[PDB]
XYZ file of C-alpha atoms in Angstrom:
286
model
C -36.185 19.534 7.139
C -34.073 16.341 7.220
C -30.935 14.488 5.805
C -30.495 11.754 3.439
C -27.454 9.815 2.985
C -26.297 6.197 1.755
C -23.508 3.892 2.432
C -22.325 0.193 0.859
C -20.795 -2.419 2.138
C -19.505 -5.653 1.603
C -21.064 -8.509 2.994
C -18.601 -12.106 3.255
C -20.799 -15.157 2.325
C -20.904 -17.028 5.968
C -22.370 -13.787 7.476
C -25.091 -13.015 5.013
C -27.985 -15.080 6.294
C -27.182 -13.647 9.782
C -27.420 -10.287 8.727
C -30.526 -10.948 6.810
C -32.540 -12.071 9.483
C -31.305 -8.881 11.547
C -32.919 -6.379 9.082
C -35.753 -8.588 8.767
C -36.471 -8.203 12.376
C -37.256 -4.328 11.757
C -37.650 -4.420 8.066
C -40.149 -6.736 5.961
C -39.239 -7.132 2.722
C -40.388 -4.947 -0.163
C -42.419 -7.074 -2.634
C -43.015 -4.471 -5.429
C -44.164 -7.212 -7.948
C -47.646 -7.190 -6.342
C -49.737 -7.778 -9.679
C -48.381 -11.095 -11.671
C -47.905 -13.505 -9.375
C -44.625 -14.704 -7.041
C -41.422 -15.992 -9.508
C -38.416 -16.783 -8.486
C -36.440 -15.015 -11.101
C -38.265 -11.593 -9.992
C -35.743 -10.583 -7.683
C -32.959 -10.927 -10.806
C -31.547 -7.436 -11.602
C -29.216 -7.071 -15.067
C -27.993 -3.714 -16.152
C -25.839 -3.355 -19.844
C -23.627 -0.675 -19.602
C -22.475 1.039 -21.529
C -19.231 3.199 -22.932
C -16.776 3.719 -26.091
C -13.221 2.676 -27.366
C -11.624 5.409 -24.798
C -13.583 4.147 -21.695
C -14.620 7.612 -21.567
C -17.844 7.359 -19.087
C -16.181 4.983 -16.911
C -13.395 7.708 -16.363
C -16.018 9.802 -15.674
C -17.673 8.046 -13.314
C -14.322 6.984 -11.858
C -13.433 10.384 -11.020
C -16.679 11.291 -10.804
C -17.030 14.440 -13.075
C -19.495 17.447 -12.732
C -21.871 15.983 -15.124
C -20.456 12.690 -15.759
C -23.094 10.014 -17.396
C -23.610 6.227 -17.084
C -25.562 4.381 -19.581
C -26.919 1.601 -18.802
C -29.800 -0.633 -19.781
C -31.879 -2.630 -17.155
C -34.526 -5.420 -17.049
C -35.898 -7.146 -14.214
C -36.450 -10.684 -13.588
C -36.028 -13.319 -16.365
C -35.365 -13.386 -20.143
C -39.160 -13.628 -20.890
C -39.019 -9.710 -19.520
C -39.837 -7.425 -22.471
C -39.840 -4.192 -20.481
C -36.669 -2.876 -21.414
C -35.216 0.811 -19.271
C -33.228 2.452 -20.901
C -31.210 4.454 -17.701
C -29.037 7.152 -17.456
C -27.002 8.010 -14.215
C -25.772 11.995 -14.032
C -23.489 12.999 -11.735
C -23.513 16.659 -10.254
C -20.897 17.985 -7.657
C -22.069 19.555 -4.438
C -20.580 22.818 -5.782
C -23.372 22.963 -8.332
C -26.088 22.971 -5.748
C -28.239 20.556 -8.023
C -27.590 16.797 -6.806
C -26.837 13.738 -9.214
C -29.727 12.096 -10.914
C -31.446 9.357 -12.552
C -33.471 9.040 -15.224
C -35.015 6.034 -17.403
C -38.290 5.401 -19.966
C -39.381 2.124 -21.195
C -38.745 0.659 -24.587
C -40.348 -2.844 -25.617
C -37.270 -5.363 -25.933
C -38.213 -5.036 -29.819
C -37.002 -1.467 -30.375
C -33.770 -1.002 -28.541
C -31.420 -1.912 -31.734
C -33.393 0.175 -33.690
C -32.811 2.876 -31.453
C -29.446 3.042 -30.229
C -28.558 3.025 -33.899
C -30.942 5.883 -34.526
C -33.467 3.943 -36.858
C -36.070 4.185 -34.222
C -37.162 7.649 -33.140
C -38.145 9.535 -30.112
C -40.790 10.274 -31.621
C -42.067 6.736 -32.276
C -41.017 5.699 -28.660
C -43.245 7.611 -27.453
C -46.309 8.151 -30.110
C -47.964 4.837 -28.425
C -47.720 7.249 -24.997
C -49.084 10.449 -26.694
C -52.066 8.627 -28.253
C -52.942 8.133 -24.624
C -54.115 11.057 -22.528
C -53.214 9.178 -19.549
C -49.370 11.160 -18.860
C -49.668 14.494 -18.356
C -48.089 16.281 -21.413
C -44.670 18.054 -19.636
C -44.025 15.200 -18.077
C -44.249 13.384 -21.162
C -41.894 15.609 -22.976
C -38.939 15.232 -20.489
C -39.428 11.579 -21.382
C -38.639 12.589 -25.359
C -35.884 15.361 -24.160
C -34.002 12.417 -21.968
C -34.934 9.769 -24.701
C -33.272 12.322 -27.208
C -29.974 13.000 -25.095
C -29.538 9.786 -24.442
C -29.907 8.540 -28.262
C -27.353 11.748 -28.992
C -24.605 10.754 -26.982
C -25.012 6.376 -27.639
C -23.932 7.987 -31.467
C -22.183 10.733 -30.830
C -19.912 9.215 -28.793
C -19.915 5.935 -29.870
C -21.072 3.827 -27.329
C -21.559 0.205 -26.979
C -22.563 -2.599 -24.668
C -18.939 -2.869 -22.566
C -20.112 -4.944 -19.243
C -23.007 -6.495 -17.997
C -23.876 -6.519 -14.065
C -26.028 -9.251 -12.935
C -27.269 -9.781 -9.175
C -30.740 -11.282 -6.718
C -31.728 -7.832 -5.289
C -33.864 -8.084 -1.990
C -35.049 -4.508 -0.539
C -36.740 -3.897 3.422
C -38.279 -1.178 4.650
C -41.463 -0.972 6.856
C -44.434 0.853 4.912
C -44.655 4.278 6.297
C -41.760 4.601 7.108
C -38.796 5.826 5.200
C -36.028 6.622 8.233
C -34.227 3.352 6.768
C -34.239 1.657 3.403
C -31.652 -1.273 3.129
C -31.003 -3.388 -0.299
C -28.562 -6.573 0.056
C -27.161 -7.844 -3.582
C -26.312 -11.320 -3.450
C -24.863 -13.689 -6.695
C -23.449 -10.826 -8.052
C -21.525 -11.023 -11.675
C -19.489 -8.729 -13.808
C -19.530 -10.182 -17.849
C -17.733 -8.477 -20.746
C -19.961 -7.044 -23.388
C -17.924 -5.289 -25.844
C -15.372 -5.932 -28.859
C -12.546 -4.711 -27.511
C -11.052 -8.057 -28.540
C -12.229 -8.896 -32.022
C -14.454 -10.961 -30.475
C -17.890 -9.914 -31.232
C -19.604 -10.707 -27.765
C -22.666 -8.881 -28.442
C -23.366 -9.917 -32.541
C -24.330 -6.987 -33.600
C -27.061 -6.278 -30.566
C -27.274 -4.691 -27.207
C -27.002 -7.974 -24.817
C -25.237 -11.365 -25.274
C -27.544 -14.182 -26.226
C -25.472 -17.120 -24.843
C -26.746 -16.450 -21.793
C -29.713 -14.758 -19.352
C -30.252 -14.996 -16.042
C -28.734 -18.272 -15.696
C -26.765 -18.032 -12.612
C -23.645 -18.566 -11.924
C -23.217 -18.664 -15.802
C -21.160 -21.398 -16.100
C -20.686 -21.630 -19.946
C -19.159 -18.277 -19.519
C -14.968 -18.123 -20.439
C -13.531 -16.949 -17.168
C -11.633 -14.114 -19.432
C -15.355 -12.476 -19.620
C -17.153 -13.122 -16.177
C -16.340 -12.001 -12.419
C -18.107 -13.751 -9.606
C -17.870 -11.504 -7.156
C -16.660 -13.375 -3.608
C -19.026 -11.018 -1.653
C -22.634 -9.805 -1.456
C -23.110 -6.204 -1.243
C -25.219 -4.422 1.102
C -26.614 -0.582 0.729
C -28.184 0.949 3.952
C -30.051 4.534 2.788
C -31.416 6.805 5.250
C -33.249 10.092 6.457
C -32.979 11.587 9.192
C -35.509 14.648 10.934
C -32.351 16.907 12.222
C -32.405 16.237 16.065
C -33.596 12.592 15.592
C -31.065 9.792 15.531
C -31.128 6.717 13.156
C -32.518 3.869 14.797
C -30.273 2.635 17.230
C -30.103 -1.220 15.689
C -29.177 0.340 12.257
C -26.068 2.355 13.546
C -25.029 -1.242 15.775
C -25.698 -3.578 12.928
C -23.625 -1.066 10.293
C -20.587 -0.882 13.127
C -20.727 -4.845 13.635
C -18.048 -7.412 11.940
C -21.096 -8.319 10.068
C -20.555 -5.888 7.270
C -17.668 -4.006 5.599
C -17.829 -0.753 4.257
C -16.540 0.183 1.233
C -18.882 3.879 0.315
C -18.647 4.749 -3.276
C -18.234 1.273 -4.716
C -19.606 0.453 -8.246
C -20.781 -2.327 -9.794
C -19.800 -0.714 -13.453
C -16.379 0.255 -12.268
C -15.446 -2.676 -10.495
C -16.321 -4.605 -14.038
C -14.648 -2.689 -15.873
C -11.751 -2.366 -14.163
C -11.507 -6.301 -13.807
C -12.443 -6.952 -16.798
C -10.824 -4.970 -18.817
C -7.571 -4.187 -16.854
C -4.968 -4.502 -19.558
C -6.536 -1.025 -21.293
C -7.153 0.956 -18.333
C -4.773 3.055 -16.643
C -6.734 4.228 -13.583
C -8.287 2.108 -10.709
C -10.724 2.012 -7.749
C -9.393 1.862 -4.109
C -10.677 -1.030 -3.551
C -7.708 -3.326 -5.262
């Protein structure tokens, strides 16, 4: 067997390029978008999350309860992206002997009002994926159970768009190889997305209009964006039991190079800096 395990850092500014030509001397980056051809917006990464009135998932995911969900929804690349994933992050203590998981399905760009307010149906979702004997049929019904419990709790519980995190993602790893998987996050930007304010942010749908992927959104009121000062870097590996990570991994993670900072969230840290007048519990790092 063998052991996975994952740890971020914090990368200052003046050291990044350094430390991205070191993991690009063992690890090419992973290009992924290998069918329409090269943009530069493709590496762009912006997730909606979202929560209610009572901040309840982010106290969730603060603490990290057994079951604990984070809603978000994702695109990549630019505002001509119609691809829409509609994600949900579940945490699972060790105690539980399941591990924490994440799930997302597609919706065209068109239909995500429609269905976080319940006037679009699982079962429409996915009728365009049924017609098609393409997915295999349980696998296509955990699609409609998540799309389902995710539509249940956005009403049940109220939730809304509360804070937007936007970042340039670059990923390495060498094909065939999966002992080390690194990610570095660069640009990246916390922006309110709720009401919590009487402002209406949103206008009555699930992502600001204002802006896109316009970094560093400057026509943003520095009450509802945070530039974050560093870049952040995630190193995941696996390890056969008796083998050793490679040796230039373990040097470059111990270096001044990096800083670590395990557990740190992109939704947290948004919220609370965002929105620090209504919350009464904080990350470490702060």
């Amino acid at each position: 067997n063998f052991v996975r395990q994952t740890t971020k850092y914090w990368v200052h500014p003046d050291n990044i390029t350094e430390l991205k030509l070191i993991i690009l001397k063992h690890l090419p980056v992973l290009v992924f978008n290998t069918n329409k051809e090269f943009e530069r917006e493709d590496s762009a990464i912006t997730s909606i999350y979202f929560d209610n009135e009572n901040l309840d998932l982010y106290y969730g995911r603060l603490r990290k309860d057994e079951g604990a969900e984070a809603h978000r929804l994702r695109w990549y690349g630019g505002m001509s992206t119609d691809t829409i994933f509609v994600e949900r992050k579940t945490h699972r203590e060790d105690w539980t002997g399941e591990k924490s998981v994440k799930a997302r399905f597609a919706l065209k760009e068109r239909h995500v009002n429609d269905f976080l307010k319940g006037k679009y149906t699982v079962d429409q979702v996915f009728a365009k994926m049924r017609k098609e004997g393409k997915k295999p049929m349980n696998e296509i019904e955990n699609l409609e159970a998540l799309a389902s419990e995710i539509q249940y709790v956005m009403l049940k519980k109220k939730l809304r768009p509360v804070v937007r995190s936007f970042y340039n993602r670059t990923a390495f790893q060498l094909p065939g190889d999966a002992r080390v998987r690194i990610s570095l996050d660069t640009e990246l930007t916390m922006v309110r997305e709720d009401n919590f304010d009487g402002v209406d942010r949103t206008h009555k749908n699930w992502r600001r209009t204002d802006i896109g992927v316009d970094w560093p959104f400057k026509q943003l009121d520095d009450k509802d964006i945070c530039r974050f000062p560093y870049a952040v870097l995630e190193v995941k590996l696996q390890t056969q039991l008796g083998q050793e990570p490679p040796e230039w991994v373990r040097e470059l993670v111990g270096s001044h190079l990096v800083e670590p900072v395990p557990k740190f969230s992109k939704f947290i840290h948004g919220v609370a800096t965002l929105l620090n007048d209504k919350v009464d519990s904080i990350p470490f790092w702060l």
